[PDB]
Design a protein around this ligand. Sequence first.
Ligand SMILES: O=C(O)[C@H]1Cc2ccccc2N1C(=O)OCc1ccccc1
Ligand SMILES: O=C(O)[C@H]1Cc2ccccc2N1C(=O)OCc1ccccc1
Ligand SMILES: O=P(O)(O)C(O)(Cn1ccnc1)P(=O)(O)O
Ligand SMILES: O=P(O)(O)C(O)(Cn1ccnc1)P(=O)(O)O
Ligand SMILES: [Mg+2]
Ligand SMILES: [Mg+2]
Ligand SMILES: [Mg+2]
Ligand SMILES: [Mg+2]
Ligand SMILES: [Mg+2]
Ligand SMILES: [Mg+2]
Lengths: 343, 343
Amino acid sequence: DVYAQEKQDFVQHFSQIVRVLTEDEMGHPEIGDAIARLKEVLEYNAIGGKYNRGLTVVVAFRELVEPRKQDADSLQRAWTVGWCVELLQAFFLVADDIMDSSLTRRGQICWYQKPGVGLDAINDANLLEACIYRLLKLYCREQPYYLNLIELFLQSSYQTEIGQTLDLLTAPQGNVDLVRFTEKRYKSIVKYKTAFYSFYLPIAAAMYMAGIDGEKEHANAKKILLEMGEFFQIQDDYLDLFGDPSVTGKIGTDIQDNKCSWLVVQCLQRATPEQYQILKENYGQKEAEKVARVKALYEELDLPAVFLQYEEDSYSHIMALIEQYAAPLPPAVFLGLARKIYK
Amino acid sequence: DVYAQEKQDFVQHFSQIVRVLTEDEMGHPEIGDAIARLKEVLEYNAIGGKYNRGLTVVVAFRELVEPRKQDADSLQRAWTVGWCVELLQAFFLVADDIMDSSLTRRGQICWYQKPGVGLDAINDANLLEACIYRLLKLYCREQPYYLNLIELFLQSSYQTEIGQTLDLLTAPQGNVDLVRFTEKRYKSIVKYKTAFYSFYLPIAAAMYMAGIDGEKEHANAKKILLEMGEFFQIQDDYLDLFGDPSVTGKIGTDIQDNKCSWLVVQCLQRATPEQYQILKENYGQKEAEKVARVKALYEELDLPAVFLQYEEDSYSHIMALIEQYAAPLPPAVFLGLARKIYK
Ligand SMILES: O=C(O)[C@H]1Cc2ccccc2N1C(=O)OCc1ccccc1
Ligand SMILES: O=C(O)[C@H]1Cc2ccccc2N1C(=O)OCc1ccccc1
Ligand SMILES: O=P(O)(O)C(O)(Cn1ccnc1)P(=O)(O)O
Ligand SMILES: O=P(O)(O)C(O)(Cn1ccnc1)P(=O)(O)O
Ligand SMILES: [Mg+2]
Ligand SMILES: [Mg+2]
Ligand SMILES: [Mg+2]
Ligand SMILES: [Mg+2]
Ligand SMILES: [Mg+2]
Ligand SMILES: [Mg+2]
């Protein structure tokens, strides 16, 4: 719950972020209209979520850095790096919503779907990315971990991008072929498209800021964090169809997009030649009726129950991993995360 | 002509680049399909142009760094940084072709227009960007200019992105309003969307590699380079409509896209209330007839001649700038560039 005691201070620092970024037109009036657009873009896409990823940088920071070294300037940099993680995600989600033909996100209409935005949202996403490195310099240029954060963020983007590539290759539009929906392919996708930036990135950022840059340390943290991410994308896939729309804040499109979802991979393993054929003739299509068909098949195979059983086993497994790789880091760093993503 | 004597060695180094980048799946077989896609993406979008921007990094490198310090490893890094500039452009052009609804580029069909690619090209562009920093590390991580190159490339992207924002704001789809097509707005757009990455970036990269990191030096080089860029985007705008399609390698879309072109800004200044009205009812529309109308108006105002007159004045002006700000750098560095973009 260390998050709630940090959330308010985090969400308020955003004003300073938007203020420091727009402080560019202060010397270049000519790009005023562009800066105004960036602000609109920041306020629409960076605001509105739970901010857990960015908060994880703050929280972990106060648990890693010794209290004496937590001055006002350190907490200032920590909030910024946390907003960088949020910007990195805004960058990916804006573009992801376009490539997934999504309709909503965080209860509102997807940025690109907004009248007047359209494909211009592609450049809007590029600017959100650029802002990550602009902030990293304005606030951490003099820090000893500067370069480390830059490489970590670029690394995390490359990995995510590699992961989005698998996501899109395995889900060719209007090209249904359940054969490629294997468990191995699935784990690879989620590992790269979600696990790295959603769990490793935040913790690793805090680690580097705390001077902890040991390869073995990061690899151990990564061992726990990537496994958490795997579970998270599984849940995201599950909620995509069985989630409460008034809670998820976004309409599902996995079945229509012909995505290699956890639900489809699970369905295939537990399906009779008859069912398999039913899934094949209704998957990856926009027809509401067909999508309702696939769902009925999922509920018939008790997937919603299979998911609840995995969440538990996953939880136990992740905890077992913490007991083995947490040290020398405070177990709470990982325990705080597990508490938030599990029930 | 120092370019021609370097071109072949440059275009051949690409194989090593594609080889070093794909050398990632060597330890991560799971992302094999993604690496294959990246290769396809690199080969389709990074190959096919004149490579002047990247060549400029090589050329300038051999003119800045003392012969004794031009070992095999230095020329290796120089070719890489040059390919990074080409990748940065591939990144922007892929996305630019989508946002401009372009049809061709370099004589071939635009990447996103290719069957099976579509909006997935958005992530393909993101990967091209990621590759810039992957190469910079694999080849220059130990160099003293490493961080400088990283910041220069990110800076150049941010500026370009700021510039693409002005380009898109000033050209709202289906929203014709010639009032915003002013000369000042125009200079701002071209300055950010083209001048920085097409002329400053290449020379600056070579400078940093040559140890020349003085602020005053860069600012002086920038004085010359940005002015060259301004001229170049003007020519690009001119060729967009009056260029030889079998030479430009791309179909024009400025008028249809309602772009704040140099030609439209020039037309507005030299137009009677009658003409102004004609331009207003035919600009920013897909109808071939209407676009043919605007063109006829342009030829009526002798714009193709006005352009030829500006190219000359621009040339003299740029040369005057070299006589003033070239030093301490070898004038040839800038003279080589001027020779290539002027007639
Ligand atoms: O916020 C998120 O999306 C995920 C990602 C994340 C990273 C670090 C710490 C917590 C969390 N999350 C989390 O706690 O999610 C909980 C959740 C998941 C789905 C619906 C509602 C809440
Ligand atoms: O290659 C380019 O597009 C431009 C950009 C550039 C940067 C550095 C040095 C030369 C050049 N160019 C150049 O020489 O262009 C010449 C040109 C322009 C238009 C059509 C054909 C050749
Ligand atoms: O299911 P996706 O992977 O597309 C998603 O989780 C976003 N995303 C993108 C990369 N990783 C995750 P979302 O359901 O939020 O649209
Ligand atoms: O005219 P644009 O600025 O769109 C262009 O020059 C590309 N570009 C993009 C940024 N700067 C230049 P192209 O005519 O090559 O499509
Ligand atoms: Mg999505
Ligand atoms: Mg997606
Ligand atoms: Mg999902
Ligand atoms: Mg264009
Ligand atoms: Mg453009
Ligand atoms: Mg053009």
